[PDB]
RNA sequence: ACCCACUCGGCACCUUACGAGAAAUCAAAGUCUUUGGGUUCUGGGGGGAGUAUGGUCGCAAGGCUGAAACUUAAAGGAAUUGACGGAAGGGCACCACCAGGAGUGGAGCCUGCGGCUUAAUUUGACUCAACACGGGGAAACUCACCAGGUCCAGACACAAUAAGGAUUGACAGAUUGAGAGCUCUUUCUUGAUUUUGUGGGUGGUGGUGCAUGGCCGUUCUUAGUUGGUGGAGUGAUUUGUCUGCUUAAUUGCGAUAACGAACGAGACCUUAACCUACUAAAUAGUGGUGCUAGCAUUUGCUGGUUAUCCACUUCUUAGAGGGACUAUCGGUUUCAAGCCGAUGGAAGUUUGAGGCAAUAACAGGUCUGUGAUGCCCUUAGACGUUCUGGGCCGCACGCGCGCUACACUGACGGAGCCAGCGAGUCUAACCUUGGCCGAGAGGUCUUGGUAAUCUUGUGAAACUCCGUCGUGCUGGGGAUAGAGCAUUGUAAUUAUUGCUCUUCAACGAGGAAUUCCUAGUAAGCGCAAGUCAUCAGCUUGCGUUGAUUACGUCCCUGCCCUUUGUACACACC
């Protein structure tokens, strides 16, 4: 009887289911637009 | 199974010692700054690492090995 | 156990089969391993009718105990085929006749 | 004396059952909840126990009378279905025999298993259903074993340590099998990635197949399984599902309280056979014509020419069809299902051979196929993993599958010379024609092919032909062993394989035993594919040559079926 109440509850899950009822900038390019300067400092070699 | 037979005698593995160093470099007085330790001469290396002192040695060791600098 | 295959059975049949079997094998609870059978309606076992009828699937579900193994077999009604054969090789039907008006001397019509 | 009918009283059987019973069954065990003819005797869950005690009878053995405490959830009856038997009756089969064929068992080697040996000789499996099986042909790898050396690839959480440095790496030397910074000397480097501890994970060809999934092997070369309406029984159940006959088959016929059905068998599907009918093909092939070579010449005969053109589809290829249904006729039989012979036919043994294959069982096998998995074990001096080397091949011997032979239906040497199933190279070195060099194995320069196109007509082998040898361990046989040359590979020593010369063992048909097999089959014979860098004496398929003898039975062996017995049902383990 369980597994008969079972199978008429999926039948109505069935049923009802025939018919029923961004975040933008792109990281990928924001390095390149970011891209802008002033980020490290080089000087060395002496002696 | 057979479970443990050996010939005693273990084997440690290491301790980077202590050292709390950097205290070689040089100063005469107030304030000159004479830098001892010599320092290596490979671009990837930029002088910022300094050559070790063994015996017929100086060795880099930011090269993790490479580039025997003999004097 | 019972309840959840005993459904499947049943929602399968719901569906229009023509026959449904499953099976659990392995341990549920006790140290030794049963296994049972659950089949409703018609099902054929043997021959090429088998490779286009019936439809089996075998799925290991990993529990604390154990593993226990699922196999389900859906027999299709082969009267909605829509591809292939329409029935088992098995099916032979004779068209029935229809009663006839016999005598009346002959005569002739004219067109 | 005998026959027939009747009648009293007998010992019994038969058929029914109104009736009775838990049923088996019963003219009483019937005339009982619609409970009363008379009367005697015994029982009140199982053990304890017909025991203890007293009485009494007995020569004795013992008889009669005859308790309790305590213990215990069953014991017991009839019947049903199973399962089993060292009971009876029927069957079926070259994993049985008969008639035989080829053998194995004897020999040398090959290979697996045991045993022994070993630092290790990793391991699973032991009647058919372990032992050329784990696709298990192991040089490294594989790899699980043994002698040794590295590494963490120890997630994540908390804590501790600590930017004055938590931690990482290394040149040379020592060291080491090692050009491993493994460790040590020495001293640069690295920057919060790690280290240390606990908790918790993770990997493992570590254990458990007697904890499991899945898969497979076996019973089964078998024929069994169920429900609808009706008949029987209070019921579990049973009849249907059966004496016989027939069949490869619970395949059918027939008998019939059964009638008609489903799963499994059959059908079905694949492969091999038949199409001068259909549709076609320069990646298949034929005739014709050009172009062309040789021999005869009288037209002829035999070739060349991946397109010089025209046509075709017999052969080849694969699509769609067709065809067989044991047909026709006749014997035999309950004149039923069928079976047998003849004719015809591509085909008439389920047309031949397969695939698929119900219910149910096994403590069959596999945790060493799985990043399938419970639990246990282990987890940094690891049972993780990698690196070097050894081992799985070790040899008084026992067992099994095989290879090659003992020759003259033969070895050898020339010569003839014919298959089929296959496979083959991209971010690569696979299948290989051809030309040269080389006795050989092979080398070298090129080439076609991602393929009906090239290797390849796979010119394979037995086999056919002409010679040499002459019955002598012979030129049969090729084990063992020496010396040399090549190939695969980082590496060939315990010799991967190939080639040459030499060495020339056992074996003269194999005791007791035992395997397989009925037609293009047995047996002989090689080939492709799997494995594969190299290595088949293995397997999976293939085609070539092609017999003898059954066409039967239950004697042996194996298994099914009834009948029967059961105190078994965890079912004779
Ligand atoms: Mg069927
Ligand atoms: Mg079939
Ligand atoms: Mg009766
Ligand atoms: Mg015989
Ligand atoms: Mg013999
Ligand atoms: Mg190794
Ligand atoms: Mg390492
Ligand atoms: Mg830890
Ligand atoms: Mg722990
Ligand atoms: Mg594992
Ligand atoms: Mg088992
Ligand atoms: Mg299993
Ligand atoms: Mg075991
Ligand atoms: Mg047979
Ligand atoms: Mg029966
Ligand atoms: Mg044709
Ligand atoms: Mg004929
Ligand atoms: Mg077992
Ligand atoms: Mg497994
Ligand atoms: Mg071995
Ligand atoms: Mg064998
Ligand atoms: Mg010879
Ligand atoms: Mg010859
Ligand atoms: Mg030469
Ligand atoms: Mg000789
Ligand atoms: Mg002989
Ligand atoms: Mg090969
Ligand atoms: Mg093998
Ligand atoms: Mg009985
Ligand atoms: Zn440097």
Redesign the interface.
């Known amino acids: 009887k369980e597994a008969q109440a079972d199978a008429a509850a999926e039948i109505a899950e069935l049923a009802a289911e025939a018919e029923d009822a961004l975040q933008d900038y792109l990281n990928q390019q924001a390095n390149n637009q970011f891209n802008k300067v002033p980020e490290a400092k080089k000087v060395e070699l002496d002696a | 199974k057979k479970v443990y037979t050996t010939p005693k005698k273990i084997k440690h593995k290491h301790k980077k010692v202590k050292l709390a160093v950097l205290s070689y470099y040089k100063v005469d007085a107030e304030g000159k700054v004479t830098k001892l330790r010599?320092?290596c001469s490979n671009?990837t290396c930029?002088?910022?690492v300094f050559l070790a002192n063994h015996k017929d040695r100086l060795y880099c060791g930011k090269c993790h090995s490479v580039y025997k600098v003999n004097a | 156990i019972r309840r959840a295959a005993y459904g499947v059975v049943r929602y399968v049949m719901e569906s229009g089969a023509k026959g449904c079997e499953v099976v659990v094998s392995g341990k549920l609870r006790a140290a030794r391993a049963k296994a049972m059978k659950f089949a409703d309606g018609f099902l054929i076992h043997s021959g090429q009718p088998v490779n286009d009828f019936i439809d089996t699937a075998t799925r290991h579900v990993l529990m604390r105990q154990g593993v226990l193994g699922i196999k389900v077999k859906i027999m299709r009604d082969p009267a909605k085929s829509r591809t292939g054969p329409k029935a088992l090789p098995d099916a032979v039907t004779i068209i029935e006749p229809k009663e006839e008006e016999p005598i009346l001397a002959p005569s002739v019509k004219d067109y």
Do not use: H, Q, S, Y
């Open positions: 010599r320092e671009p930029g002088a910022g």
